[PDB]
């Protein structure tokens, strides 16, 4: 039975982990302004997330099927972020006014970087009809969203159209959304909400987006360029610049023993976990 | 079932009513559906 670890997060067979620090999976994948360190992330062996990360969804709201997304993320080793719809491709909509004080960047109000908050321009919101075609030989992780406004006055002040929708359509996805305009509590100073959605686009499919308001449009998607045997690890331990073949959320294991009592959750070639304090096999006879 | 059509022109070409619903009700079932008219990719040659 092995009972000792180095107490550090270390490399797994040469590949350094993705330590999200005080960011979450949603904050990294949506582009929180406090998470600009993870804009271009190399190939990782496992992802480290804290138990209660401070920088998540800066603007209050939700990420639909967030735990299913993290379960999918535990089988991906590398992403390639690509601009699928440029921010300069919106000539009839406002792309620079879509900022929030709930999403600060060095004091100034800002927004998620991988999606754009589209606002009416010249007191008009034309119907967005946008299609992207996947021509990249890899599956694409595409994230979009819907803003839920507070009142009808805000709804006309942001989008000019009182009753709006967002329709999304792929070979397997058929989504229709409407904003839920209602009074809510202030989270991060904002009573409004933002519901985010994700999909996987196959390498010869299209996503059709059509909306006349409240649309948080995708700008950046993620090519899944490498897959297989990752994990998401809840750990506050610091990265110690090591190499190891077995990692647990409290440290790395350097052992040829068949058992350990360190932590049930492990990654790599590891001993079998048992909740025992002593496991000693007598090999010789008894002593006088 | 419920058919989801592609555009308002096809919706009027098939049923002539632009805004439709399906309500189903039993002792335990209370269902209200509306079509999701949207552009989608072709599966088996059909966008609907």
């Amino acid at each position, epitope marked *: 039975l092995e009972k000792t670890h180095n107490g550090k997060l270390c490399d797994l067979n040469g590949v350094k982990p993705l330590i999200l620090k005080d960011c979450s999976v949603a904050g990294w994948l949506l582009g929180n302004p406090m998470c600009d360190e993870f804009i271009r992330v190399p190939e990782w062996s496992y992802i480290v997330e804290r138990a209660n990360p401070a920088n998540d969804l800066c603007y209050p709201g939700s990420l639909n099927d967030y735990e299913e997304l993290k379960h999918m993320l535990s089988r991906i080793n590398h992403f390639e972020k690509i601009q*699928i*719809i*440029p921010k300069s*491709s919106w000539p009839n909509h406002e792309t620079s006014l879509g900022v929030s004080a709930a999403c600060p960047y060095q004091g100034a109000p800002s927004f998620f970087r991988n999606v754009v908050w589209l606002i009416k321009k010249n007191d008009a919101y034309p119907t967005i*009809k946008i*299609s*992207y075609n996947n021509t990249n030989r890899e599956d694409l992780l595409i994230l979009w969203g819907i803003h839920h406004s507070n009142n009808a006055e805000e709804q006309t002040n942001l989008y000019k159209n009182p009753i709006t929708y967002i329709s999304v359509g792929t070979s397997t996805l058929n989504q229709r959304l409407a904003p839920k305009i209602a009074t809510r509590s202030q989270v991060n100073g904002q009573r409004g909400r933002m519901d985010f959605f994700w999909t996987i686009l196959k390498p010869d499919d299209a996503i059709h987006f059509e909306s006349n308001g409240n649309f948080i449009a995708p700008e950046y998607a993620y090519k899944i360029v490498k897959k297989g045997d990752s994990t998401i690890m809840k750990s506050g331990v610091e990265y110690g610049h090591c190499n190891t073949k077995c990692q647990t959320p409290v440290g790395a294991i350097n052992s040829s023993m068949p058992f350990h009592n360190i932590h049930p959750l492990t990654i790599g070639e590891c001993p079998k976990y048992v909740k025992s304090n002593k496991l000693v096999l007598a090999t010789g006879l008894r002593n006088s | 079932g419920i058919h989801h059509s592609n*555009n308002a022109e096809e919706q009027t070409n098939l049923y002539k009513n632009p805004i439709t619903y399906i309500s189903v009700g039993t002792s335990t079932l209370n269902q209200r559906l509306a079509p999701k008219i949207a552009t989608r990719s072709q599966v088996n040659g059909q966008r609907g």
Partner: antibody
Amino acid sequence: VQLVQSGAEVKKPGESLRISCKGFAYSSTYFWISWVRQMPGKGLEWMGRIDPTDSYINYSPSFQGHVTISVDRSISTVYLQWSSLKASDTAMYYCAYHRRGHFYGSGSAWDWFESWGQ
Amino acid sequence: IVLTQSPLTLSVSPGERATLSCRASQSVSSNLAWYQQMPGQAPRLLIYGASTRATGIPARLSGSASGTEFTLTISSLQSEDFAVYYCQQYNNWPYTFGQGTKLEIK
């Protein structure tokens, strides 16, 4: 698609003119029909675009107040209109089919003119 | 966006190689097309995306992009290559064309 336009027109200044373009169906995929003016000897100038499905029009700043682009959704035909013609309006006029808001690859826009009418 | 084409006329013998240049005023980020036009006919697409040939276009038509500059190369010039060539950007609207380039038989 295959675009067919109306015949040639000879008019005097001060008259109103309506040329047409047809040959597009109710294409489910979002699409634009554009009008292009080409003066004899000169290059091409884009006048404006219309989506026939919802009658949304984007005008060039050079052609915003001079021409009117409309659509008849019943017969699937896009019209270009002048109210008061001038001598400077003597040019060849094409209608061009392209796609609306489609992208591919790393942000490449797929809205090149894919089909023109004679 | 102003697209300036170079040269305006080019007299090249058939069988040789012709080079057409198109320079933008701003960045169009490879959203540029090359069209060819005969007298009395509508323009027909040759190159989209500043590199990709359309269907039916032979491999002797080459589109290349270097930042703002774009180049169309026609190698082994046949008798049906002597026409007017146009570069059109579709990065933004309004869509703008070049002033043209007439290819003349030498």
